Please model this.
Amino acid sequence: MSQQPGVLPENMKRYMGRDAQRMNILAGRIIAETVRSTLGPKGMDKMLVDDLGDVVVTNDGVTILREMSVEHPAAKMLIEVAKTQEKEVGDGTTTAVVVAGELLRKAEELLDQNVHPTIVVKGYQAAAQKAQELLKTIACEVGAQDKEILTKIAMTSITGKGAEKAKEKLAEIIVEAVSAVVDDEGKVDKDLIKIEKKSGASIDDTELIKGVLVDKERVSAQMPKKVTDAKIALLNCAIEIKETETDAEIRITDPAKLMEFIEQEEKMLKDMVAEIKASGANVLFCQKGIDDLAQHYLAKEGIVAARRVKKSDMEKLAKATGANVITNIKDLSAQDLGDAGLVEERKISGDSMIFVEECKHPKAVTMLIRGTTEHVIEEVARAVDDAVGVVGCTIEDGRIVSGGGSTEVELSMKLREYAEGISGREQLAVRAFADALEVIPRTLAENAGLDAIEILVKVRAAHASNGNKCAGLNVFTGAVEDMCENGVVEPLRVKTQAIQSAAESTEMLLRIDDVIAAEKLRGAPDMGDMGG
Amino acid sequence: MSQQPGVLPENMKRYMGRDAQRMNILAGRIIAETVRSTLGPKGMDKMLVDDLGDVVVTNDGVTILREMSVEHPAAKMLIEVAKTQEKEVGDGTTTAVVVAGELLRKAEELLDQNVHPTIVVKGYQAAAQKAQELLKTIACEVGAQDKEILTKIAMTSITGKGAEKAKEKLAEIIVEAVSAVVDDEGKVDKDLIKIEKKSGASIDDTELIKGVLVDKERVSAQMPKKVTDAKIALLNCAIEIKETETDAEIRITDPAKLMEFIEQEEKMLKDMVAEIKASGANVLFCQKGIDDLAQHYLAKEGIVAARRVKKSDMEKLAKATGANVITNIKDLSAQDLGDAGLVEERKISGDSMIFVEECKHPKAVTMLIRGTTEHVIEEVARAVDDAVGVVGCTIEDGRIVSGGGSTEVELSMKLREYAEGISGREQLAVRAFADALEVIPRTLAENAGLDAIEILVKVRAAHASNGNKCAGLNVFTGAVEDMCENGVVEPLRVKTQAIQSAAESTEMLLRIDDVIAAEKLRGAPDMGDMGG
Amino acid sequence: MSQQPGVLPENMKRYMGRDAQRMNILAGRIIAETVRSTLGPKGMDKMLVDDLGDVVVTNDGVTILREMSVEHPAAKMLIEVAKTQEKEVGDGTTTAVVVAGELLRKAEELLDQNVHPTIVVKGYQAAAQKAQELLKTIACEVGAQDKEILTKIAMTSITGKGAEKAKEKLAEIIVEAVSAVVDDEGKVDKDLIKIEKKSGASIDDTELIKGVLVDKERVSAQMPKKVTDAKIALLNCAIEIKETETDAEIRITDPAKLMEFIEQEEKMLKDMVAEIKASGANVLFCQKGIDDLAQHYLAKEGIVAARRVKKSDMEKLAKATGANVITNIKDLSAQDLGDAGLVEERKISGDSMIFVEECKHPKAVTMLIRGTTEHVIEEVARAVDDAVGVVGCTIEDGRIVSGGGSTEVELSMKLREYAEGISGREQLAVRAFADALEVIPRTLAENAGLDAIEILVKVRAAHASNGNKCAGLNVFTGAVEDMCENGVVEPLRVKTQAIQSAAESTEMLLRIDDVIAAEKLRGAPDMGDMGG
Model:
């Protein structure tokens, strides 16, 4: 952890390559170590700064990568490996970026003085083919059989580690996920749960926003503050014929008798607003909704009025589910299915209070509540969604296996065992790598007594056909056995990719022991290089 | 109190983390000490400056946080803890930010050389769970039983400490609160009392503005100065058809006979102003109210005329309560309920005199008076509202318990007593913390004889089942017993959150003993760091 | 091999320590790698420079350490480890500094995250205790039994690798060593062989200077150029009573008759030079020898005259062996034993020709000849003495064992075997180290096919009780077996210390993972440090 900000020298690149890979390793190793420090289950506090700003976080890889802009043409290159795994999000991903970013060390050294990494590549991919193999239950103990609600609590156990409730915030965020799982489109489900928490006086326990938040606004001023039970209406954008389309080129040539034309236009919108009231719906929602004159009419006929630009609310409204496919200009009578009539609990916390009525229908619902205040909540608020979203992707079929709890430590003994097959070169850097896949679940260990490997022999005991699980950090050092929350992950899948991102990136990260460049500008401002 | 403005070094961050937490503690401790100095019941004078400006204050946390813009990425982070508690406002909040900001010291040291604060977190939250427990009467002596007017005087005893009237400004500001409590929306009540004091010749005793101030203006020039008993009218915004909507594109093509069109337009507004007078209301209020021609008509028919932009006055008018929901364009006859006819006591102090008549109805009324002059008043004017507002939130049910007067000192002995439960680690940093929750009510003490702890043994005497109260700073050192105003707070609630803001913030404030950052710009202007 | 000249930053030290050891390792590893490149049996060319100078070399550690003045407070510290081993000189020493400087890597990592190297120290010393054990023949094949002339040729095989005669320059330099071994004082023997080579026209094969060079001078001008068979004389410093001792204070007061005093003084030295000639010796040698007047007398009576300051020649003369213990002022007749009479072969090459007669007596003789020209010879001239000197120290008793030829590779398998003893911690970093003592004899390998380890399995075959030897680099890849010159070293001793210098230095090189300093000046010019 020296050489502050990539030591800040070597301004715009040059020089020779065979010491540069060792340089690439140095650059990749340092950023991998700083992240490793309290990341994943270690997870806690990583302090941030900048010139006037804030980014407190824990267990998040995208956030750490959001930063340290460049510092060497090696750090940026491997930000993407985390980024590639970031697609199909999670937090256990970057912890896996650490496992990949580590063995490459015993691998870069490896056969010290050999130009052919071409052997090591055959190995990592082989470990991945073994990965698809271990995807099929290798755990045996938990297997896949357990209540799904269990796997749900498991994600709540991890949360974002820095979780306020070291326990059951669980099924709160989960029921909304249990609803979200019914949608199962792969993304529209994470779109409904989307948005907030907090926005309430004080802190404490609150959650769900049951069936519909869908809007953000105290709703424009007339009396949104009043009129409880406004009713079912679902007009999502009234616009007026403000005497504009026109531009005419020339219009209203003759003087005097304009006393009609002025009154008639206000009249034209008053009739269209009276007919919309005929629906007996009343509530108005609208981005471009200002119709001031026939708004006062709408005030009499439609509880209140609203005024501006939230489109995501309309898509969120498509989730409110009031059939709002067709809404252009005039006359549509058939659709109005959005919930019941009870609306807007007024003035708590501040600014705006908005959540719609509920006439039961499971999905396409929102998810946000008072919970806790902004900064302390920002982190617990998001991590729990990552908890609700990642589980949502894997909950579907195609997978069965207990994760974590060193299920990996011996998955790797199998990898070391396959080394029995004499040829993948000889060294079986595939196996030598396996050794690391065995050392990493231990890097996770963090501490317990002091350092480690004391507990590794402990894991070796009882797995021949027994199975791995339970290794924990809480005061009680759990060798193996039940409800230590094992490896919370089952959805164990993420390892499938956590294993792959390694083999692909780590290979082209190496074998690249040439030049390291003396690059001419493609970006700016650059020109010439200095060193020779 | 050294290292002026965060010593002004370490320009844009870098370096290693394990000395940085001690650095975070140093940064949080210093700002916490400067505020502690004469804050809360100590409360008096904290001198301000800047490049051409003024901010004199006492007992206020938001004001101190308004300043010292940054000085370390630790000070800004914990400005928000005060800020989070600032929601549901008060002054006793930041005094509580001091109690939280103090023990973390015996806690940072604590188990000197232990990486696990994870134990300390279980403790602070436990103290909070005890907080919800002590919310239920632990005082016993006052309990909850006492006249509510008493608790009202209590808030007037505190005021903002720097209170001119070390006594009964009380029920003056309170009756308006007694009215405000009837509204009880949680915020609309604080909106009515809202605005001013002073604005009168000299100083002295004056208050209330009884039922309605609602407007600010000498009201436009014609004769607002005269016409006492102008009457009930409540037109809140007359606009004219200034021959504009138009733009036409082309209009008035032919010459000569325009002698009609000019006279007819002035005629069009004269008839609409004559009909509005038919209401026999007369008084006019209006943001966009200039109708110059039929204003002279309105001058004859409506005492005076007004002219510009105060919207908050209209919402304040909704509180005047003249039904002003519908007011667009023309013809509405049904509504006119705003008070009586007596209006505007002319020309005192200066600029504008404006307060409306009174035809009885309790709430939706204003609250401002001559009281004292601007700077000396600014502070006493606001603190008393914080007095009227914070009490307003808690006056509702769900709470019962005597506050202050060391009710806390022994609430904490209970916390130290629970330490009987052997495990929360061992040290029971929960208890070690309790010790501080016991030392802080003493930090409040300020002085009396000299230093303290002399009176702590005094508090220990008579609480086993007796109860705590009366510890004061006035010449008479009150051990315990009645009307020393005990702990003015009952509404004791604020402690509920004052206790919570601690446990949440203090935990993520610690456990953050890594990096302390070497941040790349997110704000501006920053780039590169200097130190290695 | 990056960070030119210690990257040239971190001007006068500061900062934190736990990344500094990794920094010390980096500094020690780099200098150890640059030296490793073609050093020892790899041995060839390492290019030098500077501001106007020359230092071409091969296999020499003192020369590489003579340079790279500082570059980090870690490089200088471990220059001395080479330096400590440099006492009792040799070239195989620094190759051994490389073996020590390498494993510390698998050892610094080792138990990754353990503060106790205290275990590793018990190991290196244990390897040394094993070293004294393997000193007793472990080779078995050569054992100790072989002609000593063989071990002599062995040193001539190594020479300084860059040897012109890839063969028998051997017994030439050796007979002089065979004589030198008779002296066996531990240093006076290396003092006789001391001085030169070259100093002759052209190059080619020449050697020995048989019994006596002892002087450097064409001998002062009169006729040193002539008078072959000058004879046995051994006057080593005639000084004159130049009328000086005096200073008198006052002398020669009266005028005129000084015609006596002038003639008498020249007379006083003429009689003392005539008596010295009575010895019938004739040849003169002298630092402070100018006696101009009775020098012309000495010219008539003593072939020639000499004139200035070579003291080392007198000690070299003590080796010529003409009893020259007593030589002050006047009259000593008893001693004159220096060789025969034949002297000075005149004018070849240039400047001076000087080598004395030979009347047989084995030791206390010189060793220098025409050989080759200065720069190409400088290196071959010295390396061969290191060849003649190091063998001279070990030729004495107390040792028996074949060296090199991987005798080490399996000496280490024994070290790995002792790891059978379960406790030296557990890891047996002693064994893990052994692994390196096994990998290093392979780092020696240099290349053969490509990289290595291909031949390691080759060494494993046939050593259980068979013995190790013969691994070579010449076209014929010799697995094991005879006259591949095995491990030329037997004198195998040097390993005794090559093994020790490691254990002592490598331990205090580590365990030093603190501060790395922020030093205030002790040298100059320094003051203040910059980084915080």
